[PDB]
Amino acid sequence: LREELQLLQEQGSYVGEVVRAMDKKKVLVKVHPEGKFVVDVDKNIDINDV
Amino acid sequence: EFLHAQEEVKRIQSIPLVIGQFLEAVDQNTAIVGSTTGSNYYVRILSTIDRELLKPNASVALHKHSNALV
Amino acid sequence: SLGLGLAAMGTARQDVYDLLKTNLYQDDAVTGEAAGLALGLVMLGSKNAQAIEDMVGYAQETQHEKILRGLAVGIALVMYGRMEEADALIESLCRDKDPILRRSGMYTVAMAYCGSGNNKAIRRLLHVAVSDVNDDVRRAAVESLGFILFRTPEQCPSVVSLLSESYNPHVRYGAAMALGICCAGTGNKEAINLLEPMTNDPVNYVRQGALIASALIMIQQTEITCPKVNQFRQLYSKVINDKHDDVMAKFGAILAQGILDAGGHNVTISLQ
Amino acid sequence: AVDTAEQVYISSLALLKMLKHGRAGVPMEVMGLMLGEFVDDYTVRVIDVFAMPQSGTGVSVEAVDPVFQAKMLDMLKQTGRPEMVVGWYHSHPGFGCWLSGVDINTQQSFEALSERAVAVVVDPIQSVKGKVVIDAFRLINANMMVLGHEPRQTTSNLGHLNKPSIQALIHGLNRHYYSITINYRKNELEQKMLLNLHKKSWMEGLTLQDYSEHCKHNESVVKEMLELAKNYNKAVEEEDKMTPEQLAIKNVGKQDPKRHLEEHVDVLMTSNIVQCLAAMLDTVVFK
Amino acid sequence: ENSEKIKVNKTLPYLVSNVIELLDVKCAVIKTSTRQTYFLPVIGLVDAEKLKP
Amino acid sequence: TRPANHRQLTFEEIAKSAKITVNEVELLVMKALSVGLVKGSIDEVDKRVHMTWVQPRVLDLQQIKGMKDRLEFWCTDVKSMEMLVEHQAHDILT
Amino acid sequence: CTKIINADSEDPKYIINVKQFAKFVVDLSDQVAPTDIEEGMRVGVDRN
Amino acid sequence: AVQKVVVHPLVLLSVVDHFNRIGKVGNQKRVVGVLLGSWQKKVLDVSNSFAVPFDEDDKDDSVWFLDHDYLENMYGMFKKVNARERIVGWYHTGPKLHKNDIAINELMKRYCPNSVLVIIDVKPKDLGLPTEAYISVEEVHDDGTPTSKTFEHVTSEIGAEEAEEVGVEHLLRDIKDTTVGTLSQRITNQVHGLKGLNSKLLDIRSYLEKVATGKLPINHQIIYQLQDVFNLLPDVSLQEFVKAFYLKTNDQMVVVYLASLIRSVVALHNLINNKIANRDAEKKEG
Amino acid sequence: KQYEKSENDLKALQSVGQIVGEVLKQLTEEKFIVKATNGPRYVVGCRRQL
Numbered sequence A: 001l002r003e004e005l006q007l008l009q010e011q012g013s014y015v016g017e018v019v020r021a022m023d024k025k026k027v028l029v030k031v032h033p034e035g036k037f038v039v040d041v042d043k044n045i046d047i048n049d050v
Numbered sequence B: 001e002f003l004h005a006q007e008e009v010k011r012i013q014s015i016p017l018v019i020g021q022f023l024e025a026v027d028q029n030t031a032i033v034g035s036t037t038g039s040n041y042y043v044r045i046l047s048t049i050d051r052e053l054l055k056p057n058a059s060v061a062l063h064k065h066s067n068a069l070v
Numbered sequence C: 001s002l003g004l005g006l007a008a009m010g011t012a013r014q015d016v017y018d019l020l021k022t023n024l025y026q027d028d029a030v031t032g033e034a035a036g037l038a039l040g041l042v043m044l045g046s047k048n049a050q051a052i053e054d055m056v057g058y059a060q061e062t063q064h065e066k067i068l069r070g071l072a073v074g075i076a077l078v079m080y081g082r083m084e085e086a087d088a089l090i091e092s093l094c095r096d097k098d099p100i101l102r103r104s105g106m107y108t109v110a111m112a113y114c115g116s117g118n119n120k121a122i123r124r125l126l127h128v129a130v131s132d133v134n135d136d137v138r139r140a141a142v143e144s145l146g147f148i149l150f151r152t153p154e155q156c157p158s159v160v161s162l163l164s165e166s167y168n169p170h171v172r173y174g175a176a177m178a179l180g181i182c183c184a185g186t187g188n189k190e191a192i193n194l195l196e197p198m199t200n201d202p203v204n205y206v207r208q209g210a211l212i213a214s215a216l217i218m219i220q221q222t223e224i225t226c227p228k229v230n231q232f233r234q235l236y237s238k239v240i241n242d243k244h245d246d247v248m249a250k251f252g253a254i255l256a257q258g259i260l261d262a263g264g265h266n267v268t269i270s271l272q
Numbered sequence D: 001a002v003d004t005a006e007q008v009y010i011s012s013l014a015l016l017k018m019l020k021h022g023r024a025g026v027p028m029e030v031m032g033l034m035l036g037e038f039v040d041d042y043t044v045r046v047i048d049v050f051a052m053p054q055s056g057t058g059v060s061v062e063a064v065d066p067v068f069q070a071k072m073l074d075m076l077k078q079t080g081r082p083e084m085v086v087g088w089y090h091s092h093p094g095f096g097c098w099l100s101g102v103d104i105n106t107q108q109s110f111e112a113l114s115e116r117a118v119a120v121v122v123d124p125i126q127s128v129k130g131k132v133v134i135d136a137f138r139l140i141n142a143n144m145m146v147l148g149h150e151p152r153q154t155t156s157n158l159g160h161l162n163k164p165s166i167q168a169l170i171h172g173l174n175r176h177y178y179s180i181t182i183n184y185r186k187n188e189l190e191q192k193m194l195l196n197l198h199k200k201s202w203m204e205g206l207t208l209q210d211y212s213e214h215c216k217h218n219e220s221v222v223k224e225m226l227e228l229a230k231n232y233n234k235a236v237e238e239e240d241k242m243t244p245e246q247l248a249i250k251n252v253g254k255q256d257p258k259r260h261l262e263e264h265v266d267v268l269m270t271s272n273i274v275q276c277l278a279a280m281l282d283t284v285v286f287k
Numbered sequence E: 001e002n003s004e005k006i007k008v009n010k011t012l013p014y015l016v017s018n019v020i021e022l023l024d025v026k027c028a029v030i031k032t033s034t035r036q037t038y039f040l041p042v043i044g045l046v047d048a049e050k051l052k053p
Numbered sequence F: 001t002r003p004a005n006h007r008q009l010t011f012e013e014i015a016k017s018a019k020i021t022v023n024e025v026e027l028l029v030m031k032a033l034s035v036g037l038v039k040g041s042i043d044e045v046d047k048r049v050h051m052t053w054v055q056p057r058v059l060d061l062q063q064i065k066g067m068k069d070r071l072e073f074w075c076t077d078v079k080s081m082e083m084l085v086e087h088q089a090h091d092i093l094t
Numbered sequence G: 001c002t003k004i005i006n007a008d009s010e011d012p013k014y015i016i017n018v019k020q021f022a023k024f025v026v027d028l029s030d031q032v033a034p035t036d037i038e039e040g041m042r043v044g045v046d047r048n
Numbered sequence H: 001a002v003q004k005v006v007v008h009p010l011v012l013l014s015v016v017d018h019f020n021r022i023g024k025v026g027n028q029k030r031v032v033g034v035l036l037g038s039w040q041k042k043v044l045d046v047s048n049s050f051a052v053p054f055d056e057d058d059k060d061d062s063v064w065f066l067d068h069d070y071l072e073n074m075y076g077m078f079k080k081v082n083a084r085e086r087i088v089g090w091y092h093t094g095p096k097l098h099k100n101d102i103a104i105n106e107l108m109k110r111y112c113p114n115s116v117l118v119i120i121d122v123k124p125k126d127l128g129l130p131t132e133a134y135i136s137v138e139e140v141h142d143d144g145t146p147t148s149k150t151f152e153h154v155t156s157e158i159g160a161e162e163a164e165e166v167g168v169e170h171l172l173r174d175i176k177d178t179t180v181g182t183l184s185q186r187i188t189n190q191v192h193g194l195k196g197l198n199s200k201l202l203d204i205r206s207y208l209e210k211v212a213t214g215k216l217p218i219n220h221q222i223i224y225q226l227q228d229v230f231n232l233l234p235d236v237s238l239q240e241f242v243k244a245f246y247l248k249t250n251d252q253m254v255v256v257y258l259a260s261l262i263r264s265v266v267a268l269h270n271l272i273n274n275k276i277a278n279r280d281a282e283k284k285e286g
Numbered sequence I: 001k002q003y004e005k006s007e008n009d010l011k012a013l014q015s016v017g018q019i020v021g022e023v024l025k026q027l028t029e030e031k032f033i034v035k036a037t038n039g040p041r042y043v044v045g046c047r048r049q050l
């Protein structure tokens, strides 16, 4: 229960649609209400999974 | 300690909360919610709410900072 | 003073005792660790009239805390194996609200009850191990288990079996050192079974003390004596060639390399 | 002579003046002074906190009034205790805690005056539930800028009290100041007189809330507990070897088996015992 | 000294706005150029007779 | 005179001590209820007058002495029977 | 960059809009000449 | 006429420290200070306080010093840092009030007309009294008594505020007991709730012993006339209140056949579920 | 008369504003649903004795 309470006390994530990927772990995402962005990936996700 | 864990959980819902709308459900206890501020989010939800009230849509309450479903 | 108190340890010599008093009443913040440790070492196992009285009289009105922690071990070390004669002092230090002095009484009840299975000790020491609020005195409770139970090392895995599975890391830390100091050099494999989730903890420093206690138990033991030797040598070698751990996480690893081959594999640790 | 793992002592009144002055001016980044004592090389204590009038510039060196400085100190020397200033504080509501641009400029003036002059940053509006977002910081020089800052040494009380948080280390941590450790000078002659005097009610322990509100509650809970018993019958008479640990996980409903059980029965037990024990003692005592 | 303090408290930016109405229980409603409606208990460094909607 | 021990007073005691006739004890007590120095009630099938009384006045030191003895009986009932409850429920008290 | 509505005498008293953000009333800085702050002119404006 | 005062929990605390400031030289055994407050309604509120240099001598027992000059300028500073705050009264400690308190109160009523003093108890902290508030009235005197000052009573309490209870809960962290614990906690509420029942009884024990004895003058107005109202209503009339106790049987009925049966049957499930899991894991070990 | 206006201004220095909204519906006895004039919706309460 204490492990359940600490993980919920954490800022939420953003949802954004990937247009298409760049090279070397970079993509091209407009979120909803903003410009587009070139960001970095995490460990568990890959370029070929996009 | 199990009662103090119950107390600090059951006072997350007495806050001047903001109002959003339920949009989609991903998996066990994590969902997409759109707020009345716009700018669609992605948060974790609680362990208390019976999940039979969120079928396509629901007027829902949201946290200020962590923006979770309450 | 640390060199003088160590070389003249247990002398009860008056002249080293006198200049250590006027070192203590200098009232410097940084030599308070230096005065308090050496004042106990020259009075080890003495039970003197003026030694306990002046040290327990000085340990309240001072303003620092390094002055307190040097005298914390010092009044624990002035009595050694009296086994009934410290009980008025044991009751006096723990009833006080000073957290350092309550911690100091826990080292005092450890050193007055060395190696004896005292039922009154294991009742009272475990009692403050539950109900007390400061983490530092709770450690010195669960660290003092090996000091009173090292003569019979079989009871120690049974009693610290669930002390290693509390909710705070401080009780789990002193639980790990209690395996290290009760069982000195045995190829136990039951304590080693306990230490394997202890070195796989989320919190860093309880893994550190698990690495040190694993180093303390298996000095001069080959792989044919117990099958967990080379398992942990490469586990020590893994975390010391690891990069993304803490300095706190790797301080116990480089120390474990120093313990495991100490004396050129010629000496051992044995309180017995 | 260089830094180690220090320790900050704060008095009980000092923290209360922080949160009250922060709650007062919640939008506009309130400012104040911090008055304590340097007891040794590397532990600092504070006993007293008094605030500052609001300046139109903001949290900077221009918000410090020297005539409000000396004349307020003039009064506290002859009444209470005279002591040296040891630092300052402000409030940063928009985030948790990190020294900003105009924060760090007025720090350099204070460490030129004092030895350390430890900064304190408190968010008043973040601290809600049972914990306070308080942290104290202290600027570093440029002499060891290609070397390891925070020159800390033989101790092991540094890994606690916070790891550097990512909302704080994205700014000047850790190559601009360092973080410091803060515990509380918890005292007796204050602790119990705050506890027993804030939460207390004398005659409440033997009231009745009597019976017309209470027999209705005993009426209600038994009725769904009857259906809860009927749902408890349904799983017991089922008892099939459909791999019953897997049959239970495919029949999860946040429901009966033992969770929605005696939990109600415990509430039915405790409510009637406290109701009847209060009823029997009141017949005993009064005539 | 009071007028010096008011002098240093009129700094630096002035966010312009629009007064929509005035009330008494002295009271006024302010719409800014951020299109946000505010309400006051206390007007400020002006006179209510010098103002209007 | 009787402090709510058996405060249901019979009609003949009023009719003798006030030396009023029997038929006028009812009009006499309805007047005292109308003024408001007493808040009792009247039965007439038994003709006993029930009493609840809220009007205070002076009480002439000798009646403190009887009030002391009633307070001392009040003392040892509260004191001893609390020692019964504490000694019975000592181990769940903490 | 922004746009300027007007100015007042003896002082800056500069009234400046963004057409998307709000309308501020601000001061000139030290690095400017106070002559070339004509009305309707695009000007570089500080963030703080 | 003030309804009641509200103790913000910073002011008392800020009396304890200033008693501890002079306490190294403390032999005056009393500390006078100025009680800042927020006048809301007939109910009163207290938010802050500060101190004043004060001396007093028992010799001639009217020679003393508030400092008007120190009271003007330091309150002027607290006015400048906070325009909400103003003076509402003063305080002192050393739980026996002294003969001078008529003089301090009637002096500084020219700062606030309905001024009020609060006695705290810094050393007594034990049984039942946080503070006390006094007020002054001057009528003729009574129906027949000579006129005087006559410090009167205002009831008192300890209030709180959001974003200071956070400082309450986080600084204590010591016992952390909730009201829940309804078996153990509510019985102890009945225990020490009754330990004050004889404590107020032993106080009313001692008062009429020393006035029936006849030492102090009998307050004919309120001190027993309110007790004359009191001493008629422990009604224990039997033969209908005896018939309260089938509702006791009714409160018993829910406990007995519902709570004792189901609690036993659920734990009986844990037997068969364990006795199956005992031997069916035992017979499959080999 | 001039000093009166200055002390009124020292009193007049704490009007941190108020937010103007409208009540949409009543949730409970002390919970309501309001909305800002240009912003989102909220769940609020009253002071003490409103």
Ligand SMILES: [Zn+2]
Residues within 6 Å of the ligand: D059, D090, D091, D092, D098, D099, D100, D103, D121
């Ligand atoms: Zn800042």
